[PDB]
Write an enzyme that holds these catalytic residues in place. Structure first.
Site, short mmCIF file in Angstrom:
data_model
loop_
_atom_site.label_atom_id
_atom_site.label_comp_id
_atom_site.label_asym_id
_atom_site.label_seq_id
_atom_site.Cartn_x
_atom_site.Cartn_y
_atom_site.Cartn_z
N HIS A 27 -7.55 41.43 24.70
CA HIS A 27 -6.13 41.26 24.50
C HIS A 27 -5.73 39.80 24.56
O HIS A 27 -4.79 39.40 23.88
CB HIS A 27 -5.41 42.12 25.56
CG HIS A 27 -3.97 41.81 25.68
ND1 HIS A 27 -3.01 42.28 24.82
CD2 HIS A 27 -3.32 40.98 26.55
CE1 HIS A 27 -1.83 41.78 25.19
NE2 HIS A 27 -1.99 40.98 26.23
N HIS B 106 0.45 36.19 30.19
CA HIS B 106 1.70 36.64 29.60
C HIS B 106 2.71 36.97 30.70
O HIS B 106 2.38 37.26 31.86
CB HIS B 106 1.45 37.83 28.70
CG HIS B 106 0.76 37.50 27.43
ND1 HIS B 106 0.05 38.45 26.73
CD2 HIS B 106 0.74 36.37 26.69
CE1 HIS B 106 -0.41 37.90 25.62
NE2 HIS B 106 0.01 36.64 25.56
N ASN C 25 0.67 44.20 21.58
CA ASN C 25 1.00 42.85 21.19
C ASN C 25 -0.28 42.01 21.13
O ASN C 25 -0.88 41.70 22.16
CB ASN C 25 2.04 42.27 22.14
CG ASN C 25 2.53 40.95 21.70
OD1 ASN C 25 1.83 40.24 20.94
ND2 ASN C 25 3.72 40.57 22.16
N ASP D 201 4.44 39.59 31.33
CA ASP D 201 4.29 40.86 32.03
C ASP D 201 3.26 40.81 33.16
O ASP D 201 3.14 41.80 33.89
CB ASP D 201 3.97 42.01 31.07
CG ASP D 201 2.75 41.83 30.23
OD1 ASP D 201 2.45 40.72 29.78
OD2 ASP D 201 2.05 42.89 30.00
N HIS E 138 -3.63 37.99 33.35
CA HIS E 138 -3.62 37.03 32.25
C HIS E 138 -2.28 36.33 32.25
O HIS E 138 -1.45 36.55 33.13
CB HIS E 138 -4.03 37.63 30.86
CG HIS E 138 -3.09 38.61 30.28
ND1 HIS E 138 -3.06 39.94 30.64
CD2 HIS E 138 -2.16 38.47 29.30
CE1 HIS E 138 -2.16 40.57 29.89
NE2 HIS E 138 -1.61 39.70 29.08
#
Ligand SMILES: CC(C)c1cccc2c(-c3ccc(CS(C)(=O)=O)c(C#N)c3)c(C(=O)O)[nH]c12
Ligand SMILES: [Zn+2]
Ligand SMILES: [Zn+2]
Length: 231
Positions: free
Chosen positions: A149, A86, A180, A88, A84
């Site tokens: 998420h 993000h 998050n 990280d 995805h």
């Protein structure tokens, strides 16, 4: 030997953990808004090459990841998939791209990364835009379970080893909250997890985006913590 935890990895260092034959996780730590967090990715042997799933959350962490792979495995990383948008997952894509790695993500992920100001994988992964879609990519299957998420989250299955890499749609068993959730769809998440459960009933190892791998129970636990966070 034990799976390495957040206080055991200084920020900037990367650990590998053997999951199964030809399957490793990678673990690194990063600071975000003044707290330190671990995060996982995956490495899958692809003959005499390696497929990487997700960066190590940052440029210097990702450079350290490549060095650790060379030290411990000694095969070239030729392709990477980010699961995805993000940091990280994509922070470190520019490092990868300068190290000869072809970087991939869904078009959704690429758009979201661009809009966020995050690093952008080079190549688009078509065939993943509707929930339940699956495509092959080297030695893995990529699966889009639906929004969880994030709206773009992908999961990865290693059929040779029955390893399910849930990414950030799946939480570790010790988790007490849904992580998050800023970009999450809490209402759709349990339905997306149910799709994962239905698609991969033979999974033997389940790896979350952050924290300790376990078995199939991570899926139900994730649904539970998400419902309780929403409620
Ligand atoms: C947007 C990205 C870059 C990001 C930044 C900072 C933290 C996170 C977390 C996260 C993960 C696990 C936990 C412990 S938990 C399950 O018990 O809440 C926490 C906490 N607290 C945060 C995730 C995530 O959820 O994927 N992404 C993150
Ligand atoms: Zn995320
Ligand atoms: Zn995450």
């Amino acid at each position: 030997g034990e799976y390495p935890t957040v206080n055991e990895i200084p920020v900037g260092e990367v650990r590998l953990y053997q999951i199964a034959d030809g399957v490793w996780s990678h673990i690194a730590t990063q600071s975000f808004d003044g707290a330190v967090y671990p995060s996982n990715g995956l490495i899958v042997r692809d003959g005499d090459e390696l497929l990487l799933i997700d960066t190590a959350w940052g440029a210097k962490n990702t450079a350290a990841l490549l060095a650790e792979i060379e030290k411990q495995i000694g095969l070239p990383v030729t392709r990477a998939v980010s699961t995805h948008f993000h940091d990280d997952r994509v922070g470190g894509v520019d490092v990868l791209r300068a190290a000869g790695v072809a970087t991939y993500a869904s078009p959704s992920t690429r758009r979201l990364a661009e809009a966020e100001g995050n690093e952008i994988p080079t190549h688009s992964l078509e065939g993943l835009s509707s929930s339940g879609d699956a495509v092959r990519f080297g030695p893995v299957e990529l699966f889009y379970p639906g929004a969880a998420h994030s709206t773009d989250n992908l999961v990865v299955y290693v059929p040779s080893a029955n390893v399910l890499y849930g990414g950030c749609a799946v939480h570790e068993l010790s988790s007490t909250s849904a992580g998050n959730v800023a970009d999450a769809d809490l209402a759709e998440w349990p339905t997306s997890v149910e799709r994962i459960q239905k698609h991969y009933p033979e999974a033997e190892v389940v790896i979350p985006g952050h924290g300790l791998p376990g078995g199939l129970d991570l899926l139900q636990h994730t649904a539970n913590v998400v419902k309780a966070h929403k409620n």
